[PDB]
Design a protein around this ligand. Structure first.
Ligand SMILES: Nc1ncnc2c1ncn2[C@@H]1O[C@H](COP(=O)(O)OP(=O)(O)O)[C@@H](O)[C@H]1O
Ligand SMILES: NC(=[NH2+])NCCC[C@H](N)C(=O)O
Ligand SMILES: [Cl-]
Ligand SMILES: [Mg+2]
Length: 356
């Protein structure tokens, strides 16, 4: 590590202290004992502790605040990642090791809201990393194009329900883009947390979205992760949604080599998406229980569920519509993950029905 870097790190660490109102896991776990212990480390690709915490330092409002420039970062800066991963994922020790991929008995899933008075839509996604490629911050503009090439090709061989067209962000009309974002299909453009983590370089080169005409199956290309395999649709038919995602992933996995860590499961750019990389969500309306986003969040937390705005994380709820999903992704199976969301939603719906 050079000198200019340490200057910004020492300056960054101090900033986290003078932010009495900062509640990010970064501040909560980057002790002076942890800071000094690794701030002088660098990875084979030149990633430093600054490339890891820069986003959380510049955005005190972050909930986590860090990212892994390359797979090696997860271990080079273990002292910092390890405790953050443990806290977030509901308890993941140092000796712990994520379990083997297990979709589970899909047949055991049920409809989330029959009467259809609360649930608007259901969605489940996973994240994958192409072997041979580092994470965003370590990518060259040429690598974004290479990766875009590989993924688009592999997806052109999707058949039946999973058959669709790849739409590059480069050349996409502002109208088409804005609509796909507003319809909750396409990832938003320019996220401050990602920008400051240098995850958006050369934008929009190599970025794109693949999806079948129904747009119930989608693959985000080069946003936060190399790939994001999405399955979504209106209603609470979690069974179908999950089943579809499973089909897609198993198929895609037989064609593209994805990075998998003996301990962290499937590797991702961010620590909250490790392991199963699964975020099973629903856009739900709970008028009585959501009489204060805060009281709703306290309820959901008891079920290991997370609450997000209608347009995604770091956004507000629009017209009572909230994004509730399983928070944990590492330390449990795909099946267990999707189940925490299922079980959690079923109870909250009940609590809502009995609510005064
Ligand atoms: N259950 C859902 N129904 C419809 N859209 C969803 C659903 N869950 C999330 N979304 C949409 O996914 C997009 C990305 O949201 P974000 O919070 O970044 O989640 P992620 O990165 O895990 O996919 C946003 O448009 C959000 O509105
Ligand atoms: N997509 C994600 N990694 N979301 C969770 C972290 C988001 C942001 N870096 C924060 O810590 O607030
Ligand atoms: Cl994260
Ligand atoms: Mg996202």
């Amino acid at each position: 590590v050079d000198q200019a870097t340490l200057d910004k790190l020492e300056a960054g660490f101090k900033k986290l202290q003078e932010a009495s109102d900062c509640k990010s896991l970064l501040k909560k776990h980057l002790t002076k004992d942890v800071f000094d212990s690794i701030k002088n480390k660098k990875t084979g690709m030149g990633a430093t502790l600054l490339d890891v915490i820069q986003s959380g330092v510049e955005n005190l409002d972050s909930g986590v605040g860090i990212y892994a420039p390359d797979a090696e970062s997860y271990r080079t800066f273990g002292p910092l990642f390890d405790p953050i991963i443990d806290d977030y994922h509901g308890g993941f020790k140092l000796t712990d090791k994520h379990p083997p991929k297990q979709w589970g008995d899909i047949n055991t899933l049920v409809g989330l809201d029959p009467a259809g008075q609360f649930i608007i839509s259901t969605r489940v996604r996973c994240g994958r990393s192409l072997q041979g490629y580092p994470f965003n911050p370590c990518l060259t503009a040429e690598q974004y194009k290479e990766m875009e090439e590989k993924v688009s090709s592999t997806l052109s061989s999707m058949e039946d329900e999973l058959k669709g067209t790849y739409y590059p962000l480069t050349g996409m009309s502002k109208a088409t883009q804005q609509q796909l974002i507003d319809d909750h299909f396409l990832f938003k453009e320019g996220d401050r947390f990602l920008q400051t983590a240098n995850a958006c370089r050369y934008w929009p080169t190599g970025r794109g979205i693949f999806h079948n005409d129904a747009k119930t199956f989608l693959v985000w290309v080069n946003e936060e992760d190399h790939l994001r395999i999405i399955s979504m649709q209106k209603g609470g038919d979690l069974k179908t949604v999950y089943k579809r995602l499973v089909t897609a992933v198993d198929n895609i996995e037989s064609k593209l080599p994805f990075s998998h860590d003996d301990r962290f499961g499937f590797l991702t750019f961010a620590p909250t998406n490790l392991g199963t990389t699964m975020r099973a969500s629903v856009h739900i309306q709970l008028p009585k229980l959501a009489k204060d986003r805060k009281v709703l969040e306290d309820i959901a937390s008891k079920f290991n569920l997370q609450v997000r705005g209608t347009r995604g994380e770091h956004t507000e709820s629009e017209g009572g519509v909230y994004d509730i999903s399983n928070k944990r992704r590492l330390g449990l199976t795909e099946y267990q993950a999707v189940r925490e969301m299922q079980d959690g939603i079923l109870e909250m719906i009940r609590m809502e029905k009995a609510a005064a």
